[PDB]
Design a binder for this molecule. Structure first.
Ligand SMILES: C[C@@H](O)[C@H](N)C(=O)O
Ligand SMILES: C[C@@H](O)[C@H](N)C(=O)O
Ligand code: NA
Ligand code: NA
Lengths: 384, 394
């Protein structure tokens, strides 16, 4: 439940037994042969795992320093790593006898992942979304409907993600006997930070095997962007006990840290309680969750998972920021140099790795988690 | 050269020398150990091959007949099978010592695939595109530029695909010493129909291995959509000598075959010469414009190897309408959580009809040639259709 002092279960008493039943089921199924046969089957035949580990040779040689490898989560079905967790939790729900999934979404990206997995497994799917975000995210809202999910606009409060989160929790209180609440990052009350990290750790397990095959050694650095922190935990976790491997998480610096327009909870936030967890959040002087900004739609979550708060505390991982401008430059650079259009989220990681590689020797190795593809971002990048 | 009477090399004398040197290079490299090692390296680590073969269990059980398997080319880097051929030809060009790729594009899909492969291999890329197709494909144009390609609008004549083909061909005659002309389907003068089919046949070889693993036998039927015919040849070719495997190609029926707004060259076209080949084409004696809700089923002809398979009755060719393809697009999305390309939705629609005819435990493989992210704007416009006398969708 706790990663040092971070984490917990800050929920109404009515959710304590549903969370206990979720943990009990998870511990029974996570190493179960039939659960894992089915999970691996869907990850392989529907999602397309394993994803490759790609040597960005042209990019590496241009920069003239460390080798840059990309872990190609952009090739997962749906175009983002979110699918790994959506499948894992949807299958868990089905094994628990649940017939319905709920989730919240801001950018729409987790709503789409949840809708895809629910459709695969024949589950009913309802997605809560702040009405402001519904308005802005026309294409993700349509995708969700096409996939058979019902998008429920949330018109109360500020009509954004915090309000969707509150409605989802209210629904789960009433419907948990048949409904699974599918949390989309390494956030929420225990056991969700643990479960999500476990379902994303396939990224790092593949990457470790792949870099050993390609280079005969472990990487010197792993770089991943951090919203809530799921793609970063997924790639980091299998290397945590390899002391030599540096772990770097990259938060959204937005218009700059001194600008008021970013989403850098670890770098600029403070300890607080939100979404059922004690962690770092961007919160105003009256304890209210602040609006965030990033050019990357999915780096909008106003906090970070407790395991990252912990890794930062113990200095096992370092957390940095990259600006919209730096991310955009990396988006263009990777596209023209390697013929891979990255997600704007992932472009933050690419940007930082490019900076880092310049300083490192040519025999050193950086793996970047390319968490998604950038097709979804083309309208945004055109407008800029 | 030919497939029965079809195919050939009906070109001006200017194109003979570049085609001869291409044929000679392909003979040299096609089975070369180093060429193939590099090709397979890029297909694995950049494109993400192999793609999976997926048992659409929910769709199969809903329809209540034959098993429907999907060959998941939608998962290839770029979201379509075109990538396989783009990489093959771009790498061939590099092994030939070329530094530049040119191509033509209508929908923009082959232009993007060519731009991606050129970016991968550090090659200059120029894409010819009819000015009218440029105006109607703002996103694909941007995408090509983001990938480092230059898009050259063709303003001459009709300002469409036929004109871009002519401009590309003119460029190649002038620049072939250092430029490869990258054709995007199983069309054009020899040796292109053969080369493109060879670079797509990995689809079928994987699918054969995968169905034998999954079901312990070969499929009863393979179904694929047909524009020019490359995704269909790629999945068909390794099964051609497996006598009991039926092969079905699905062309765009558009607004209906009677409507004269379709792209069904095999079903309703006439034999003639265009793009330096003899095949079926939709014509007046000139090329007639085509229609399909699917952008990439717009080529006004069809590859000569399909014309041959049709003639010897090895493969059957059918049509599906816009409306049937849209229904399949929606059905696959909500039943399996896979949003297909509108092109591929034609194959899905036909397979859903065919599966109902067949017995439980018979096996259909559908080539899912691409994903449908690119098509969401098109489908949203139909779904939110506003009647002329209304102010909002009812
Ligand atoms: C934080 C939230 O926006 C998440 N990235 C989603 O797509 O829903
Ligand atoms: C026929 C032509 O439009 C091809 N499908 C392309 O994308 O360029
Ligand atoms: Na944040
Ligand atoms: Na045609």
């Amino acid at each position: 439940m706790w990663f040092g002092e971070f984490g917990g279960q800050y929920v109404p008493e009515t959710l304590i037994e549903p969370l206990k039943e979720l943990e009990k089921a998870y511990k029974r199924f996570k190493d179960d042969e039939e659960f894992n046969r089915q999970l691996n089957y869907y990850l392989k035949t529907w999602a397309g795992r394993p994803t490759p580990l790609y040597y960005a040779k042209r990019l590496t040689e241009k920069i003239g320093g460390a080798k840059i490898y990309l872990k190609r989560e952009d090739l997962v079905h749906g175009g983002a790593h979110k699918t790994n967790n959506a499948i894992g939790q949807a299958l868990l729900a089905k094994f628990m006898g649940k017939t319905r999934l709920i989730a919240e979404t801001g950018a729409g990206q987790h709503g789409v992942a949840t809708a895809m997995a629910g459709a695969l497994l024949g589950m009913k799917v309802d997605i809560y979304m702040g009405a402001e975000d519904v308005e802005r995210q026309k294409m993700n809202v349509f995708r969700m409907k096409l996939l058979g999910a019902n998008v429920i606009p949330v018109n109360s409060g500020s009509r954004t993600l915090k309000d969707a989160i509150n409605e989802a929790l209210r629904d789960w209180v009433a419907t948990f006997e048949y409904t699974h609440y599918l949390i989309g990052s390494v956030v929420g009350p225990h056991p969700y930070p643990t479960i999500v990290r476990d379902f994303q750790s396939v990224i790092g397990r593949e990457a470790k095997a792949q870099i050993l095959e390609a280079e005969g050694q472990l990487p010197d650095v792993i770089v991943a962007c951090v919203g809530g922190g799921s793609n970063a935990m997924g790639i980091f976790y299998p290397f945590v006990n390899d002391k030599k491997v540096k772990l770097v998480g990259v938060e959204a610096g937005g218009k700059g840290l001194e600008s008021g327009k970013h989403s850098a909870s670890l770098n600029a936030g403070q300890v607080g309680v939100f979404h059922g967890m004690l962690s770092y959040f961007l919160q105003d002087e009256e304890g209210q969750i602040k609006p965030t900004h990033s050019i990357a739609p999915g780096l909008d979550y106003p906090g970070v998972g407790p395991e990252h708060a912990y890794l930062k505390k113990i200095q096992r991982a370092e957390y940095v920021t990259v600006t919209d401008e730096e991310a955009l430059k990396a988006f263009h650079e990777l596209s023209r140099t390697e013929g891979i259009i990255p997600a704007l989220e992932s472009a933050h990681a690419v940007a930082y790795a490019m900076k880092l590689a310049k300083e490192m020797s040519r025999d050193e190795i950086i793996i970047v988690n390319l968490s998604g593809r950038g097709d979804k971002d083309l309208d945004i990048v055109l407008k800029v």
